[PDB]
Amino acid sequence: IRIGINGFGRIGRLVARVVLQRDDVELVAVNDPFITTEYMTYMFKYDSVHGQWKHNELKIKDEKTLLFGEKPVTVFGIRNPEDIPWAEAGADYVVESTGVFTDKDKAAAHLKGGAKKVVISAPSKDAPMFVVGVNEHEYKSDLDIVSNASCTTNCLAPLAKVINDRFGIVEGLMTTVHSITATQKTVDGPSMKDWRGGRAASFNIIPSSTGAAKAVGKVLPALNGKLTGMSFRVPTVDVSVVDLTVRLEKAATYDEIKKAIKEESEGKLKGILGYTEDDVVSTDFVGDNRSSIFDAKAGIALSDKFVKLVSWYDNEWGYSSRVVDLIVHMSKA
Amino acid sequence: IRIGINGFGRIGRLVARVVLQRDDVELVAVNDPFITTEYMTYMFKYDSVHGQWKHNELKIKDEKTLLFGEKPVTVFGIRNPEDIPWAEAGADYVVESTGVFTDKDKAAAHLKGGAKKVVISAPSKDAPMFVVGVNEHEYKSDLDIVSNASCTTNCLAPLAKVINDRFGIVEGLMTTVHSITATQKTVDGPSMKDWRGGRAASFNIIPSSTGAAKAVGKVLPALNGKLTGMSFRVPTVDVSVVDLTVRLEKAATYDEIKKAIKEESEGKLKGILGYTEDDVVSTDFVGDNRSSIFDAKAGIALSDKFVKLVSWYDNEWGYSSRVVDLIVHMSKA
Amino acid sequence: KIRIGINGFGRIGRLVARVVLQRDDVELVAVNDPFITTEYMTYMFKYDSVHGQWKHNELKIKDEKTLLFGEKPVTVFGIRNPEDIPWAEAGADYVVESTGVFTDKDKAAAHLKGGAKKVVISAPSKDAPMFVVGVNEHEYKSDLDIVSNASCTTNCLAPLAKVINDRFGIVEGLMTTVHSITATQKTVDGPSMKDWRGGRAASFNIIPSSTGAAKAVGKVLPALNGKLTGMSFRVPTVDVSVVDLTVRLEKAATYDEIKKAIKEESEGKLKGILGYTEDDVVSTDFVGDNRSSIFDAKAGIALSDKFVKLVSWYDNEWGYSSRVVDLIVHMSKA
Amino acid sequence: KIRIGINGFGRIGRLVARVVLQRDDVELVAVNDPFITTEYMTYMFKYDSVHGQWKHNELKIKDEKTLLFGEKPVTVFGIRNPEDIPWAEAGADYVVESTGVFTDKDKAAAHLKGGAKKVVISAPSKDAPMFVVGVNEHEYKSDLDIVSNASCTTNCLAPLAKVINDRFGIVEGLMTTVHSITATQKTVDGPSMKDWRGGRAASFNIIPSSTGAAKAVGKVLPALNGKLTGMSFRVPTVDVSVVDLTVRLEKAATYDEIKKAIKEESEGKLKGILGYTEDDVVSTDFVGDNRSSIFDAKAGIALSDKFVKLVSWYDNEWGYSSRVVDLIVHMSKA
Ligand SMILES: NC(=O)c1ccc[n+]([C@@H]2O[C@H](COP(=O)([O-])OP(=O)(O)OC[C@H]3O[C@@H](n4cnc5c(N)ncnc54)[C@H](O)[C@@H]3O)[C@@H](O)[C@H]2O)c1
Ligand SMILES: NC(=O)c1ccc[n+]([C@@H]2O[C@H](COP(=O)([O-])OP(=O)(O)OC[C@H]3O[C@@H](n4cnc5c(N)ncnc54)[C@H](O)[C@@H]3O)[C@@H](O)[C@H]2O)c1
Ligand SMILES: NC(=O)c1ccc[n+]([C@@H]2O[C@H](COP(=O)([O-])OP(=O)(O)OC[C@H]3O[C@@H](n4cnc5c(N)ncnc54)[C@H](O)[C@@H]3O)[C@@H](O)[C@H]2O)c1
Ligand SMILES: NC(=O)c1ccc[n+]([C@@H]2O[C@H](COP(=O)([O-])OP(=O)(O)OC[C@H]3O[C@@H](n4cnc5c(N)ncnc54)[C@H](O)[C@@H]3O)[C@@H](O)[C@H]2O)c1
């Protein structure tokens, strides 16, 4: 299980922290043209949210290798995927976490290097989409390039599946309150694709567009077309919270809904879905590695068919775990 | 129209800025035991959100009077409402904006001074509740003490009334993303009444409880029991956004909903309800004095009976305007 | 008379424009920014996170070409390359270079090829002469093809440093600045090849950052050249900074006397440039303050009467943008 | 042996407790806070915005009375008045006074009435002697009924100031601190009768704030007494501060030599107290760092070899809370 990372960013570095820590996978190659080999060293070591790394990893040679205890990782800086030699240093698995190559077409440039699989660290217009714990088994050794969906979809689908599996969802609207990301700006700046997105990120509540509810349909067909949503970017560095307003087919009191989710959190969905009854706020989930954590005391019901459910997620650390879990599930057909 | 302010806080100072600016009202008395006469001078002058004041106002005498151009305001520091002599210096109208005296019973201590009316700057368990533009006409010269509802209710009811007036609301769930307030804490501290509320305010998304949807019923009886909601406190100094997920009786496309609201914003509800199609984020509404501003591009519809609507509000400045408008409407039966 | 052009419609670009538009003695001719659509330009100008909505005007007419500011029409350019900018072809005699990427004297010169008579660089340069208004803008000479309005920080420091120097003389001085974030920073830990700490998430760190401001003062105030050095920390505020000045003086003084001295100069030659407050100010109190430097009497502290620390506030965006307009005006007369 | 009591379960209260609980050489006996319910105490201890969830333990048993920390049981008090605190009745030999409201030597003494042998004030005092670990904790003498662990800032400054002083001697020095917000500040502009700027909304202002840290150094380091003075700015970060030191030295030096000197002392007597980094650090890099002062070589700047500026990082909450525990331990031995 040799893993390469394309784009050593929030997700890429975090995914590296996760990979290097597990004993069943190994980190073979990193690519990022914008970060020099040594600089990678600094970026990996220090982190504003996740803390200084607690094991070890340094620069061995002028530009080609880092040393983690005793495992070499080679370092590339290649602007173009097709010109990444994942082959010439092993790494059957590639995490595509640049944000520019989500088109299955564009991520395939990785097959041209020596790479058996590609995992895109975002939703794709056109790549099978899997969310661990909900539809990862729909996977096949014959799918070359795949997607781990998005952090929001990963938080939503697990709650969504359980909710519909047992009470059925007539209709659903989701709102997420979400932390800022690399695509935002420190001060009002240009972002042609999304205008509300150039506004100074830590000083505004910025409405923002999210395709996750339309994505839950595409990993969970019973719900296809039955949910949609929007988002608000707000000024926290990390952690987000999903807010789902749903209409239930079968009448259910709040307490019933509560321990139906508690059960799955203990059962099939342990490690993916969590459940809490504490008075948590978002810093409480920094470093939490579940996909979704249901917040019982938070949610609210109008009537036993109409209800609002709140679930947390650490958009960076949770989603990064799931990437590794997909990859491992991949290698075991 | 002589107005006194109890508790020279965010709302009280802002309401003072609003009163002093209008020509149809006058600011007679301010009470606040925790702020000395001169200090009031400093607090009124400078403001982190609203800017330095643009007309003028200074300390005349050791502890009893401030001078605004040529109008004296007397300054009290009395811990107990019943012992405030609103009489002995005029001021028929009192804005109760301390946050400790929302009980109609407790606000009545103001009638014991020389005061014809009291306006509570918050919801009351037991005081008639009015939201300008929605039910201010249900008022009577015989109601002694009143409530201007809450900032969220003031943002919600105007959208709510229009929505139900024309398409009918079967069921509604509201979420607000809301700025932090004086009740929150800079760092994790004690708040026995609400635990998620002691967590460091500018570093968390903090779920929080709101009675506004249950309050919209109590100024708009058609909707009584047909909406509820929750809130998220987030790290912006001012401005909040209401997010309403509603189920409509009569089918309506999004565009229809849009210009049905546009119309009222131009019509009956001008100055209370606004409408925009721009890419606004919350700083865009700092200083906006409407009750509610509908954000068209933001909202979303699943189906023509199920829809999500987004409206902004400047929790401090909008609500403070409305207080003055209630008071003025009061004095004119 | 006095038509102006702006290259780089960013924070300084748009703001210098809110200024040029509010004055009578100056006109806004055209703007260039290859990264902002003509309609986007109206959105960005109109709404501002720090300085509020713009309250006079203001729309566009030409599919891509022209913006109507009230009734004045501004020509809109989306052109990468500076010499490809036909400034004159839309009579733009003065060009504000607020791009951040052409602070070189030869670099800025590309604007002249375009048919343009002067280029003011809204940022310090390695070569272009540096003038700070109220300190040495008289060295301007009509020959200077290209100029620099130096930095926000140098504008807060210099005015202040002069009064202190020209009344008690500065022997030795060290400068710290507590500065707001800027567009060069990152929302989230990200790549900053030229400055590593500067890649760290901006609104959640106190970030040591470099500044030349204390040495630039020597270049605009050759009296002081070589006697000042400093550093900065970027911190999570959207706008407004503060200068922290540690100086030793030849001429003994008290805090009261240095306080009185500053007030004097404040209404003298340096009115509107150097300000003086004795209130309990905090940084939001200075948002939209057009003065280059505001001295804060109650904040500072003294060790001796020769060893002292001096506090000056400044709105890095608005004071500086005002100053650019000022300096241009003075170059039009002289 | 070494049982400890905490008055004021706040930021310093709860954190000194995460410390006392992690060590073997010390026990946590009981806590007092009239404003926190016994069950609330577990919530507040458990979850923390800056330092994460606590990862060893930990529950309660007694309706109101007792908390189980792993298997150690802690007695919970909700009592306003210090002398009403029967500390001994629950064998608590050492009392950490982290309330903020009893920093007076006679004020702290109320704890002794309660049957308690020593009171460490987690904050500087007007009277109580001030010891800074690694600088002068040896002046402790077994007679001292009551002690002060001084301030977070004095702990960052003193260690550093000594190395500089005892190798090149400080003639004259001025200190600035860029400091994180604390519980004394306000989310929103609100009343601060004792300090007006300190009432201003904390996460949206750079706030000038006062500090005695440079003068407290003289009281713990009488070599330096009267040669340092300073100020601070509070800024929108939740934890971690940085010290800005402007000093002139009798003994000429280079930046390299002062750099080498600090490193030396860093592993010498002052290991674990004074730290030394040459990396590209920012303030989050120091969250949960238990050292009292971390010197930052790349940040600082030098004017002469007698005029220099020195940068030290510090986690005001965690370093200080570690230090309190340290000083108590040293008082148990000596
Ligand atoms: N941050 C989150 O909460 C989060 C969560 C889920 C999914 N994602 C997804 O992950 C992807 C990256 O997100 P991020 O938050 O890490 O952003 P990021 O900006 O920190 O990472 C981008 C990285 O890619 C590198 N890069 C850019 N072009 C490259 C190229 N052609 N070759 C190699 N490297 C290149 C950059 O230097 C940078 O380090 C996006 O697709 C994003 O939607 C992010
Ligand atoms: N800030 C908002 O967005 C907002 C919006 C709508 C309603 N309100 C309501 O307004 C009220 C106050 O809100 P705020 O945000 O201005 O808070 P705030 O803390 O700034 O104001 C409270 C003020 O009351 C003074 N005070 C306390 N006790 C007093 C007493 N007994 N006599 C006289 N003065 C006393 C205080 O010194 C303080 O100045 C609350 O009821 C709140 O729910 C606030
Ligand atoms: N923001 C401040 O506090 C401030 C203060 C004083 C000085 N300055 C200086 O001002 C300059 C710009 O600063 P800013 O803060 O406005 O930066 P900014 O990023 O906000 O603005 C730069 C603008 O330049 C545009 N741009 C980039 N490349 C261009 C090109 N080839 N042609 C035309 N436009 C281009 C960008 O689209 C952007 O709109 C820098 O040199 C900086 O040192 C900034
Ligand atoms: N937070 C810091 O960075 C820090 C660092 C160094 C020193 N200090 C010092 O520590 C002291 C406390 O600081 P803090 O930051 O933890 O403050 P804090 O407000 O967070 O904690 C004070 C605690 O004292 C409790 N309390 C108040 N009155 C009490 C009483 N009568 N009896 C028992 N408990 C009472 C409060 O409930 C609160 O839990 C102050 O003296 C401060 O100078 C704080």
Side-chain angles (χ1 to χ4, degrees), chain B residues 4 6 28-31 64 74-92 94 109-115:
Chain B
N6 203 29
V28 166
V30 186
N31 193 46
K64 260 114 176 258
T74 45
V75 183
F76 302 131
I78 279 106
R79 201 126 168 175
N80 27 299
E82 48 146 73
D83 294 338
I84 308 157
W86 306 116
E88 331 248 344
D92 299 332
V94 157
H110 291 317
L111 304 168
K112 286 188 237 164

Coordinates of all heavy atoms in Angstrom, one line a residue, chain B residues 4 6 28-31 64 74-92 94 109-115:
Chain B
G4 N -36.0 58.3 27.8 CA -34.9 58.0 28.7 C -34.4 56.6 28.4 O -35.2 55.8 27.9
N6 N -32.6 53.2 30.0 CA -32.1 52.4 31.1 C -31.0 51.4 30.6 O -31.4 50.4 29.8 CB -33.1 51.6 31.8 CG -32.7 51.2 33.2 OD1 -31.8 51.9 33.8 ND2 -33.3 50.1 33.7
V28 N -33.7 62.6 26.9 CA -33.7 63.3 28.2 C -32.8 62.7 29.2 O -32.0 63.4 29.8 CB -35.2 63.3 28.6 CG1 -35.3 63.7 30.0 CG2 -36.0 64.2 27.8
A29 N -32.9 61.4 29.5 CA -32.2 60.8 30.7 C -31.5 59.5 30.3 O -32.2 58.7 29.7 CB -33.2 60.6 31.8
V30 N -30.3 59.4 30.8 CA -29.7 58.1 30.7 C -29.4 57.5 32.1 O -28.8 58.2 32.9 CB -28.4 58.1 29.8 CG1 -27.9 56.7 29.6 CG2 -28.8 58.6 28.5
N31 N -29.7 56.2 32.3 CA -29.2 55.5 33.5 C -28.3 54.3 33.3 O -28.6 53.3 32.6 CB -30.4 55.1 34.4 CG -29.9 54.6 35.7 OD1 -29.1 55.2 36.4 ND2 -30.5 53.5 36.1
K64 N -23.9 65.0 36.5 CA -25.3 65.0 36.4 C -25.8 65.3 35.0 O -27.0 65.1 34.7 CB -26.0 65.9 37.4 CG -26.6 65.2 38.5 CD -25.9 65.6 39.8 CE -26.6 65.0 41.0 NZ -27.4 66.0 41.7
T74 N -29.6 64.5 31.5 CA -29.1 64.2 32.9 C -28.6 62.7 33.0 O -29.1 61.8 32.3 CB -30.2 64.5 33.9 OG1 -31.5 64.0 33.5 CG2 -30.4 66.0 34.1
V75 N -27.6 62.5 33.9 CA -27.1 61.2 34.0 C -27.3 60.6 35.4 O -26.9 61.2 36.4 CB -25.6 61.3 33.8 CG1 -25.0 59.9 33.9 CG2 -25.2 61.9 32.5
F76 N -27.9 59.5 35.4 CA -28.1 58.7 36.7 C -27.3 57.5 36.7 O -26.8 57.0 35.7 CB -29.6 58.3 36.8 CG -30.5 59.4 36.8 CD1 -31.7 59.4 36.1 CD2 -30.3 60.6 37.7 CE1 -32.6 60.5 36.1 CE2 -31.2 61.6 37.7 CZ -32.3 61.6 36.9
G77 N -27.1 57.0 38.0 CA -26.4 55.7 38.2 C -27.2 55.0 39.3 O -26.7 54.9 40.5
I78 N -28.3 54.5 39.0 CA -29.2 53.8 40.0 C -29.4 52.4 39.7 O -29.9 52.0 38.7 CB -30.6 54.5 40.1 CG1 -30.4 55.8 41.0 CG2 -31.6 53.5 40.7 CD1 -30.5 57.1 40.2
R79 N -29.0 51.6 40.7 CA -29.0 50.2 40.6 C -30.4 49.7 40.5 O -30.6 48.6 40.0 CB -28.3 49.6 41.8 CG -27.8 48.1 41.6 CD -26.3 48.1 41.9 NE -25.8 46.7 42.0 CZ -24.5 46.4 42.2 NH1 -23.6 47.3 42.3 NH2 -24.1 45.1 42.3
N80 N -31.4 50.4 41.0 CA -32.8 49.9 41.0 C -33.8 50.7 40.2 O -33.9 51.9 40.5 CB -33.2 49.8 42.5 CG -32.4 50.9 43.3 OD1 -31.2 50.8 43.4 ND2 -33.2 51.8 43.8
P81 N -34.5 50.1 39.3 CA -35.5 50.8 38.5 C -36.4 51.7 39.2 O -36.5 52.9 39.0 CB -36.2 49.7 37.7 CG -35.3 48.6 37.7 CD -34.4 48.7 38.9
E82 N -37.2 51.1 40.2 CA -38.1 51.9 41.0 C -37.5 53.2 41.6 O -38.2 54.1 42.1 CB -38.7 51.0 42.1 CG -37.5 50.3 42.8 CD -37.8 50.0 44.3 OE1 -38.6 49.2 44.6 OE2 -37.1 50.7 45.1
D83 N -36.2 53.3 41.7 CA -35.6 54.4 42.3 C -35.0 55.3 41.2 O -34.1 56.2 41.5 CB -34.6 54.0 43.3 CG -35.2 53.2 44.5 OD1 -36.5 53.5 44.7 OD2 -34.6 52.4 45.3
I84 N -35.4 55.2 40.0 CA -35.1 56.1 38.9 C -36.1 57.2 38.8 O -37.2 57.0 38.3 CB -34.9 55.4 37.6 CG1 -33.9 54.2 37.7 CG2 -34.3 56.4 36.6 CD1 -34.1 53.2 36.5
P85 N -35.7 58.5 39.1 CA -36.7 59.6 39.0 C -37.0 60.1 37.6 O -36.8 61.3 37.3 CB -36.0 60.7 39.7 CG -34.5 60.4 39.5 CD -34.4 58.9 39.6
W86 N -37.4 59.2 36.6 CA -37.6 59.7 35.2 C -38.5 60.9 35.3 O -38.4 61.8 34.4 CB -38.2 58.6 34.3 CG -37.5 57.3 34.3 CD1 -38.0 56.1 34.7 CD2 -36.2 57.0 33.8 NE1 -37.0 55.1 34.5 CE2 -35.9 55.7 33.9 CE3 -35.2 57.9 33.2 CZ2 -34.7 55.1 33.5 CZ3 -34.0 57.3 32.8 CH2 -33.7 55.9 33.0
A87 N -39.3 61.0 36.3 CA -40.2 62.2 36.4 C -39.5 63.5 36.5 O -39.7 64.4 35.7 CB -41.1 62.0 37.7
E88 N -38.6 63.5 37.5 CA -37.9 64.8 37.9 C -36.9 65.3 36.9 O -35.8 65.7 37.3 CB -37.1 64.5 39.2 CG -37.7 63.4 40.1 CD -38.3 63.9 41.4 OE1 -38.0 65.1 41.7 OE2 -39.1 63.2 42.0
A89 N -37.3 65.2 35.6 CA -36.4 65.7 34.5 C -37.1 65.3 33.2 O -36.4 65.3 32.2 CB -35.0 65.1 34.6
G90 N -38.3 64.8 33.3 CA -39.1 64.6 32.1 C -38.6 63.3 31.5 O -37.5 62.8 31.9
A91 N -39.4 62.7 30.6 CA -39.0 61.4 30.0 C -40.2 60.5 30.3 O -40.2 59.9 31.3 CB -37.7 60.8 30.6
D92 N -41.1 60.5 29.4 CA -42.3 59.8 29.5 C -42.0 58.4 29.0 O -42.6 57.4 29.4 CB -43.4 60.4 28.7 CG -43.8 61.9 29.1 OD1 -43.6 62.2 30.3 OD2 -44.2 62.7 28.3
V94 N -39.5 55.3 28.4 CA -38.2 54.6 28.8 C -37.9 53.3 28.1 O -38.8 52.4 27.9 CB -38.2 54.3 30.3 CG1 -37.3 53.1 30.6 CG2 -37.8 55.6 31.0
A109 N -41.2 48.9 37.4 CA -40.5 49.7 38.5 C -40.3 51.1 37.9 O -40.1 52.1 38.7 CB -39.2 49.1 38.9
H110 N -40.3 51.2 36.6 CA -40.2 52.4 35.8 C -41.4 53.4 35.9 O -41.3 54.6 35.8 CB -39.8 52.2 34.4 CG -38.4 51.6 34.2 ND1 -37.3 52.2 34.9 CD2 -37.9 50.6 33.4 CE1 -36.3 51.5 34.5 NE2 -36.6 50.6 33.7
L111 N -42.6 52.7 36.0 CA -43.8 53.5 36.2 C -43.8 54.2 37.5 O -44.3 55.3 37.7 CB -45.0 52.6 36.1 CG -45.1 51.8 34.8 CD1 -46.2 50.7 34.9 CD2 -45.4 52.6 33.5
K112 N -43.1 53.6 38.5 CA -42.9 54.3 39.8 C -42.1 55.5 39.8 O -42.3 56.4 40.6 CB -42.3 53.3 40.8 CG -43.2 52.2 41.3 CD -42.5 51.4 42.4 CE -42.5 49.9 42.1 NZ -41.5 49.1 42.9
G113 N -41.1 55.6 38.9 CA -40.5 56.9 38.6 C -41.5 57.7 37.8 O -42.7 57.2 37.8
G114 N -41.2 58.8 37.1 CA -42.3 59.4 36.4 C -42.5 59.0 35.0 O -42.3 59.8 34.1
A115 N -42.9 57.8 34.7 CA -42.8 57.3 33.3 C -44.0 56.7 32.8 O -44.6 55.8 33.3 CB -41.6 56.3 33.2

